[PDB]
Amino acid sequence: MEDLIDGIIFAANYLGSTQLLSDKTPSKNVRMMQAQEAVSRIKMAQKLMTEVDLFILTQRIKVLNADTQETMMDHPLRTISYIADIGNIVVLMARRRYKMICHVFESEDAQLIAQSIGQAFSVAYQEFLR
């Protein structure tokens, strides 16, 4: 069986990524405006998406290509600062480039994906504390 420690997987469609400058630890509302922004830039581009598997666990975030299963993205949970589900859309913001990097996905499991990452967050932050 696979738990959140091993890593669990969700089907999702990568839509593209964007960037931004943000304070270190912003308030939640400003952090939602960031996500909403990434989604905006993504959509404008889609008017003016090949399948993937989302790998979530307490140790890292991975994106494998639904077909080949080749690792397309792998990020240490440490580098992931915020995650949000906007409708069926998922926004994953990371560090390194302050400049932040946002990957945007689309999924019927967007709500479950966020839940899963937040719980991953909890597990990793308490480990860190004790």
Binding site: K24, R31, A35, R78, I83, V91, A114, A124
Partner: peptide, 10 residues
């Protein structure tokens, strides 16, 4: 959405 509390000390 959620904020990773750990992310700050890195």
């Amino acid at each position: 959405g959620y904020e990773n509390p750990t992310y700050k000390f890195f």
